[PDB]
Amino acid sequence: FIYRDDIGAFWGIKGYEELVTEVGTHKGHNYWPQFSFLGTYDSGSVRRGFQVFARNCGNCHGMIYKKYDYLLDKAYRQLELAQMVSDFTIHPAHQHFKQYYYQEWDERDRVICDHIYPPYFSQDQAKNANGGVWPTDFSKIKLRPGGINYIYNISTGYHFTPPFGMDVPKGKYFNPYFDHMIIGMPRQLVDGLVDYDDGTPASTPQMAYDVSNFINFMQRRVGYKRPDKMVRYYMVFTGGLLILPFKYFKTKAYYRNLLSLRWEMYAVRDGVYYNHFKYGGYNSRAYQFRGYFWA
Amino acid sequence: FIYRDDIGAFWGIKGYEELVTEVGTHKGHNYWPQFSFLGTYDSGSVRRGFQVFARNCGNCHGMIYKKYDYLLDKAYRQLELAQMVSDFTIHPAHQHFKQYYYQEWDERDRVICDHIYPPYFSQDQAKNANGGVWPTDFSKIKLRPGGINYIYNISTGYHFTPPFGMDVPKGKYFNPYFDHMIIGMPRQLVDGLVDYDDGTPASTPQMAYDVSNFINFMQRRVGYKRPDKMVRYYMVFTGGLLILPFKYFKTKAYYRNLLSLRWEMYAVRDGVYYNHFKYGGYNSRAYQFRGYFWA
Amino acid sequence: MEWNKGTYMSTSIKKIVQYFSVMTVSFHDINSLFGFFTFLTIASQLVSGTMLAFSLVPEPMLIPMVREEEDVEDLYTDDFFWLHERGVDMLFIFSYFHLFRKIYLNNFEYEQEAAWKSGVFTFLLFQVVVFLGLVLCCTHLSDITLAIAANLYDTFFAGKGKFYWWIFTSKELNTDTIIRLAYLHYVLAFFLAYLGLIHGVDMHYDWKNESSMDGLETEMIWFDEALSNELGAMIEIILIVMIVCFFMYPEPEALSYEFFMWGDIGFINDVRFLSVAPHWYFRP
Amino acid sequence: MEWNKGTYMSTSIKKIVQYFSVMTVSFHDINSLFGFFTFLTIASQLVSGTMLAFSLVPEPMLIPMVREEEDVEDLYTDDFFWLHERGVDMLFIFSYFHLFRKIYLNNFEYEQEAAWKSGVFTFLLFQVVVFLGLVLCCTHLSDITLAIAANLYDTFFAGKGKFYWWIFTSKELNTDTIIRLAYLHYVLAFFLAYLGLIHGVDMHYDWKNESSMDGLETEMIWFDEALSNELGAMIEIILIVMIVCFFMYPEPEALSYEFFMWGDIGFINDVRFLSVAPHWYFRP
Amino acid sequence: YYPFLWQFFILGTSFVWFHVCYDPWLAIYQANNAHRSLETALTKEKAHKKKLAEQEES
Amino acid sequence: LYAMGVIGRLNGWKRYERDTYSEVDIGALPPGEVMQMVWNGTPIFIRRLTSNEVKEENELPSNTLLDKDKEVILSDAGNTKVIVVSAVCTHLGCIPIPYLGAYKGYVCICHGSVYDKFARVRQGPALLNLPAINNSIHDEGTLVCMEQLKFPHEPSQRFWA
Ligand SMILES: CCCCCCCCCCCCCCCCCC(=O)OC[C@H](COP(=O)([O-])OCC(O)COP(=O)([O-])OC[C@@H](COC(=O)CCCCCCCCCCCCCCCCC)OC(=O)CCCCCCCCCCCCCCCCC)OC(=O)CCCCCCCCCCCCCCCCC
Ligand SMILES: CCCCCCCCCCCCCCCCCC(=O)OC[C@H](COP(=O)([O-])OCC[N+](C)(C)C)OC(=O)CCCCCCCCCCCCCCCCC
Ligand SMILES: CCCCCCCCCCCCCCCCCC(=O)OC[C@H](COP(=O)([O-])OCC[N+](C)(C)C)OC(=O)CCCCCCCCCCCCCCCCC
Ligand SMILES: CCCCCCCCCCCCCCCCCC(=O)OC[C@H](COP(=O)([O-])OCC[N+](C)(C)C)OC(=O)CCCCCCCCCCCCCCCCC
Ligand SMILES: COC1=C(OC)C(=O)C(C/C=C(\C)CC/C=C(\C)CC/C=C(/C)CC/C=C(/C)CC/C=C(/C)CC/C=C(\C)CC/C=C(\C)CCC=C(C)C)=C(C)C1=O
Ligand SMILES: COC1=C(OC)C(=O)C(C/C=C(\C)CC/C=C(\C)CC/C=C(/C)CC/C=C(\C)CC/C=C(/C)CC/C=C(\C)CC/C=C(\C)CCC=C(C)C)=C(C)C1=O
Ligand code: HEC
Ligand code: HEC
Ligand code: HEM
Ligand code: HEM
Ligand code: HEM
Ligand code: HEM
Ligand code: FES
């Protein structure tokens, strides 16, 4: 019932005890406009996040489940998004299921309807290219310790050094936010790496923040639809609060009114005998008692 | 009910008046071992057909639905078929449903489990490489006039010349068995084209026969499973014929036995009145007549 | 619903068991049994069709490839597909022969109404089910059938709006349309069994072998005396149909109405309009 | 079957309509309304699951992508999925509260037998359906659930002769297993409605909101006097659940139990066995 | 006394319920997030592009 | 006949066994060395055992021989014995460590599932020894031929004729 707070398991959820998972949610409060009360995605933030994802980190990762056209109202316009995404190529080998629709036999410029594939054809190609470790697919990445913060923390937590007794193999890097604090990703965010279109200063915390906002935006439950659904929840709750009194009037006051009955019992001493009571009564389940009980 | 043969429609089936349909089925009888009574596929014929399809055909055609390992128990064994099919290559772009199973990023030697794909990645590539006309997929090709004869006729019927009023465009050829008698396939079978493994003489009629047998072997209702189903139909028909007498005994002679009744009507002139006839009887659907009829 | 006076026979399991274990059948002939042949065949469609449910993925672009691969790797799948296909034809034949037999006997009298309408409704539903089944083939025949059905449905609304979309999404066989039509096909196919049971219960009220009223009071017991005869007559009719098909349908045939089924939607975008023909039952 | 005496109620449309239009309910409290909440959640589960079925293609390798893509291109699909999940949660909550309430009142008397067992059977079936539903997610949670269920099934047979194959083909989630389990899930989910109707008819024989025998003879007419109160109590409990979930579960959270649902069958081979946890209802 | 008119009245009450529970929350929600709209980002990008274009070399 | 059809449809049919045969060159392996190979896309350990190592490995208490019902197969091909085993922790599936100080066998970091050079269960929550991979030696120890054990699948006749 009471779960110790220093075991490394948050609220009793065992596992993830070789990770730093409470940062930003339980210990510390990183502010994300999406999850604030009556909050929403910052359009500029998601725009810059897609810019940084395309110019970097799209060369190893991808969102096979997602497609670019999700960014058509809050992050980009159709023409702008088409122009931006036409800088990349997809071979038919990328397609997960051609189904006779994709008739191309050579590389072609991506369209906004295309799924976000990595530059590699398959997972094994990416795993081979990255030292035998596969850059995880960012679709459905919401399910990580810390949620939206997970992208932000890992991209930034390359500062600490390993303790005694922990060995980082060559080609591996220490990052306390990853499982077992060893990650195969070299640090990617560096100040000035990406030149934003709006002129926002490009410091690694800013790039990490924008990437996290975009990755979260591409999710389905905690993504671009959560704020509106939360507002809908608020409206429905207000409606229920407003309807409670009318429910009370309909049900409880009405029942109390129906029970305002006056009863009277008199003394009937006429010759009539109470033979109906002695010989009477019907039981709907009598067929279950006949020949079985009290014989 | 009575149909006309001079029209050009077999048995009154319209829509095929622009090609030859009765060459080897209705007006001719080309012998095929598979369709003969108690017939079965000739293993050598299908072996030679696959050898031809893997050296001349296949480089233009293919069977997306079928795969090589169909030939394991009748034409080729596992090791032999693997050796034969290892000479071809499939890019990941070939796969109709690449899925996560196919984790290749380059060409690799085919395996008997691979579907029969043409060298082209899609229909459009084949059209581009074949003058804008797509080499039809042989899978499900059974549904053409003459059935198995179709492949044999087109493979062979190139000797005739067009009549006046018909113009053959450059890159097209006159073949009376094809739709409108104009086909984009140059005559492929030439004597000595394929050197068989069994030493069989290589002539265009023999090659056409072997190819037709192989192409028919890959069909579902017809092909490798038809002869056994025909034998099964024969067996079931025999069983029904043999069960008919016992059905007769159990039903008709039995009813005749039950009908051997004696009846006797006597004169009952006792004072008793026939009250039951006058006041009696019930009807199940009385609820459907009460309050509605005869009043 | 006071206007409703109840039901003819309660379909409780015990009541059904007792009714069928006590039912008696007057002496009859083969002509007056087509109805049973119509039911037994349905009893196979529910079985064979079910075996096809576990095989067919409602994705239009995978139904042909899945069918072809299951013909080889799986066993009896193609056998059940053939059984289903020929069961549709046999069911049409039996139902129309039963309809003709009941029309010849002048079974339109009032005491026949419950027997007649309850039957015809089932027949009507049967037609609908058949239609859905065709759409599941994902051939050009299915495309044409769906197009015609959507056009007829839209004709009611005078071409205004998109009231057909909830089932005929885009008037084309896509994932949504195929999924919805397949599930409805299964549901209505299983509902046909209940409708047929109701019809069979109702029709016994005034069931007769021939128009002329034989004065016979004794009757057979259905369970074995009539059931065995019905099964044997079914066997005989199957034998007759097989004999007919052997001569009428040689496997290598110059032409057939089935050739129009060659095209698979999505794979081939060109439809051969010159040779368009449905299955014989929907031919009229 | 002479041992079976009959049925308490004949569930015909005429008689059901009459019974529910003449039903009377004694005055009660919220504690004795968990059954209505369970039934209403069952109805919403039926509706939402029917809506979801038209989106879910039973191929394992397409279910994740199909779910992700059809939440955007189609409106209300993710709403129905969320409604289905929360309906399962609330259905478990209401069912267990009902079980505890009926255990509290000592309803093990003979007159409660038909009321009690008919309910428990429903509950039992309600378990099976839930299991099947989990399998349809095609995540690592579904993989582990299927593996555990297959091992339990194989326990009875001492691991001999693959008796599990007809459902748990290879003990893995593939096209055949997913198709079969999805269809069985749909059919049993719809059968739960009939089971609940039978249980509700049976339990009214001796219904009491409290153990003490109140002497009141007047009772509420069900259609609106009792139904309105039932709906209002459902609304109140839903408001309470919304408040509790809103405050107990912060918008972003660390170390949730859904983190084991990240892995999708096929896409991810390695399974993080360190953190394996089912939904809270199968947690015990 | 006209049942269908009373049904129209019930429909009107449901409409009032919906609008009362809908308009205030939507208004406040879209007033709170005025500065997070895409138009603000587009304006900022346009201003930066103009500033970069005016100051540059050949 | 109908019931056979239904049940056979429910129970899939394995029409043929996919090839898994493989050959590994091990003659040149120095004695007392463990080599890791990939067979059927799974790790496997192949080791050469001399006469001296047998004395060390086999001389342990019988009680410590958890799962005594298990059998150990030594190829005994060539001058020295050759042992081929599957490298996987049967408890959860992780790869056991090739070497440990306590024993010249295989141990698991996850739960200390110690396995000797014969892959016997030692101080492990595992319910079985390391899975044994069917194999044989025919090149006098130079080459090892491996193939998955063939179980019966029926009916095995696809065509009557
Ligand atoms: C291809 C096209 C095909 C066709 C498509 C079209 C199909 C059309 C179907 C037509 C069905 C007709 C049904 C007739 C009865 C209806 C009720 C009645 O009498 O009305 C008078 C009534 C007069 O007003 P009133 O004086 O205030 O009385 C109100 C009471 O209802 C007055 O009730 P009461 O208090 O006097 O007593 C109620 C009840 C006492 O209470 C009960 O006993 C209740 C019933 C108990 C058993 C069932 C439990 C479940 C409850 C019913 C189901 C409800 C949910 C349905 C969900 C459907 C799927 C979504 O007693 C009875 O009336 C007994 C009979 C009940 C009806 C059943 C028997 C007759 C109809 C069916 C006969 C055939 C058998 C069925 C199968 C047929 C198959 C072909 O009319 C109305 O009030 C109508 C209001 C309508 C507007 C409000 C709701 C709108 C919906 C809002 C949601 C958003 C959608 C908006 C609409 C969009 C466009 C549609
Ligand atoms: C099939 C879908 C059913 C959907 C049901 C949803 C409910 C719809 C009604 C909502 C409330 C609105 C009511 C408005 C007032 C109506 C008053 C009225 O007319 O009373 C009727 C009366 C009312 O019942 P009553 O007469 O018992 O009322 C007594 C008085 N009260 C109610 C106050 C107690 O009953 C009827 O006549 C019912 C008619 C039902 C008709 C259903 C037809 C469905 C057809 C489906 C397709 C069929 C296909 C067949 C196969 C084809 C194959 C090719
Ligand atoms: C989230 C879970 C918990 C909360 C769920 C929220 C509620 C969901 C369901 C609400 C249904 C509507 C309220 C019904 C309450 C009972 C009303 C009653 O007894 O009737 C008398 C009342 C009115 O009777 P009255 O007597 O109070 O007043 C009218 C009388 N005169 C005219 C003399 C003044 O009926 C109504 O106002 C509406 C009746 C509607 C029909 C009843 C069933 C509705 C079912 C919903 C779907 C309908 C679909 C129709 C279209 C066809 C679609 C296929
Ligand atoms: C026309 C008669 C109507 C019914 C008559 C009823 C009385 C029967 C009297 C006894 C008959 C005894 C002989 C039966 C021989 C059956 C064939 C046999 O032995 O094969 C076993 C075989 C097993 O053979 P096997 O074990 O030797 O292995 C060979 C395997 N194959 C064939 C793949 C190479 O089992 C089956 O094929 C079972 C039937 C297929 C699966 C279920 C679908 C059935 C579809 C209908 C098929 C029949 C078509 C004609 C009838 C249509 C329906 C009316
Ligand atoms: C009134 O007029 C009418 C007619 O007359 C003209 C009709 O003919 C008709 C037509 C009638 C019909 C279509 C009904 C005929 C139906 C047919 C042919 C198909 C169904 C036939 C059946 C026999 C269904 C049987 C169903 C079952 C579930 C039982 C399966 C059968 C058998 C032999 C197995 C029985 C044994 C078991 C289930 C138990 C086996 C296992 C064990 C013993 C082990 C148990 C122990 C452990 C540990 C598991 C109607 C409707 C009518 O109304
Ligand atoms: C042991 O193995 C087994 C299993 O798996 C383990 C099983 O699942 C099973 C059982 C399962 C099955 C056999 C599979 C059954 C599957 C089911 C029921 C899942 C589907 C469930 C549903 C509720 C589907 C509901 C579908 C819909 C609402 C779709 C609606 C679509 C439509 C078109 C409706 C409108 C149309 C109609 C009503 C048709 C009427 C006619 C027209 C409109 C005419 C139009 C044309 C013209 C010209 C006018 C068994 C028996 C088993 O043995
Ligand atoms: C190729 C050089 C990469 C670039 C560019 C980016 N990442 Fe990556 N990432 C890469 C690899 C090879 C791995 C696997 C590491 C391992 O030990 O498995 C990763 C992993 C991540 C993760 C963790 C995924 C998980 O399942 O835990 C995250 C959160 C991640 N990477 C984020 C990330 C960001 C924010 C990037 C810039 C926007 C980025 N990656 C670029 C390889 C590469
Ligand atoms: C590339 C040079 C090809 C070779 C090698 C083979 N075929 Fe072909 N075929 C080719 C084309 C471009 C076409 C389409 C022609 C048209 O007008 O559409 C075809 C067509 C056929 C057909 C008819 C297809 C139809 O739908 O009716 C048949 C029966 C056919 N081809 C058979 C065939 C055989 C047996 C071959 C090996 C001997 C063969 N083709 C090789 C291109 C090429
Ligand atoms: C799926 C479609 C049908 C099925 C499964 C079916 C089934 C049956 C069965 C089993 C019987 C009893 C056996 C017998 O026929 O002698 C029967 C009888 C009968 N059926 Fe049907 N039938 C169908 C269609 C029809 C049609 C289309 C009609 C009328 C147009 C009809 C009306 C009748 C009648 C009138 C009887 C005999 C009752 C009498 O003689 O008065 N049925 N049916
Ligand atoms: C009286 C009942 C039924 C009838 C009349 C019927 C009719 C049909 C028809 C006409 C077809 C297509 C015909 C063709 O391919 O030429 C078909 C196919 C099919 N049926 Fe049925 N059917 C019935 C029951 C069922 C049931 C109950 C199911 C599943 C539970 C089912 C599943 C299928 C499937 C999956 C196909 C397509 C198979 C494939 O394309 O590979 N059927 N049916
Ligand atoms: C009382 C009735 C039902 C119960 C208790 C139930 C239970 C469940 C459960 C527990 C899940 C998994 C949820 C999760 O893992 O988060 C599920 C998923 C699902 N259910 Fe049901 N279910 C019911 C009715 C239905 C019906 C009637 C249908 C179809 C007609 C249906 C179709 C589905 C589908 C398609 C999914 C998976 C959806 C997806 O993965 O996107 N359910 N169900
Ligand atoms: C999905 C599962 C269930 C449904 C849909 C359901 C439905 C209902 C409903 C609507 C009622 C009337 C309202 C009420 O009494 O609160 C009821 C009463 C009752 N239920 Fe259930 N119930 C379910 C599970 C159970 C279980 C698990 C039990 C016992 C283990 C049970 C035993 C009873 C009994 C004995 C009553 C009558 C109480 C009395 O006589 O006072 N039910 N049920
Ligand atoms: S995981 Fe290797 S022993 Fe537990």
Numbering used by the authors:
A (entry chain D), B (entry chain d): 25 to 319
C (entry chain C), D (entry chain c): 1 to 284
E (entry chain I): 61 to 118
F (entry chain e): 109 to 269
How is this structure described in the published paper?
We purified the intact respiratory supercomplex from mitochondria of the ciliate protist Tetrahymena thermophila and determined its structure by single-particle cryo-electron microscopy (cryo-EM). Here we show that a supercomplex containing all four respiratory chain components contributes to membrane curvature induction in ciliates.
This tilted arrangement offsets the transmembrane region, consistent with its curved membrane environment. Furthermore, we observed map density features close to the two conserved haem bL groups, which probably correspond to ubiquinols bound at the Qo sites. The distances between the Qo site, haem bL and haem bH within each CIII monomer are consistent with those observed in mammalian CIII2, with the two haem bL in COB being bridged by a non-canonical UQ. We detected density for two copies of the flexible UQCRFS1 head domain, which contrasts with recent work that found only the head domain proximal to the CI quinone tunnel to display flexibility, whereas the distal domain at the CI interface was proposed to be non-functional in electron transport. Thus, our observation of the distal UQCRFS1 head domain flexibility, together with the haem bL-wedged UQ, suggests that functional symmetry is maintained in the ciliate CIII2 despite deviation from the structural symmetry.
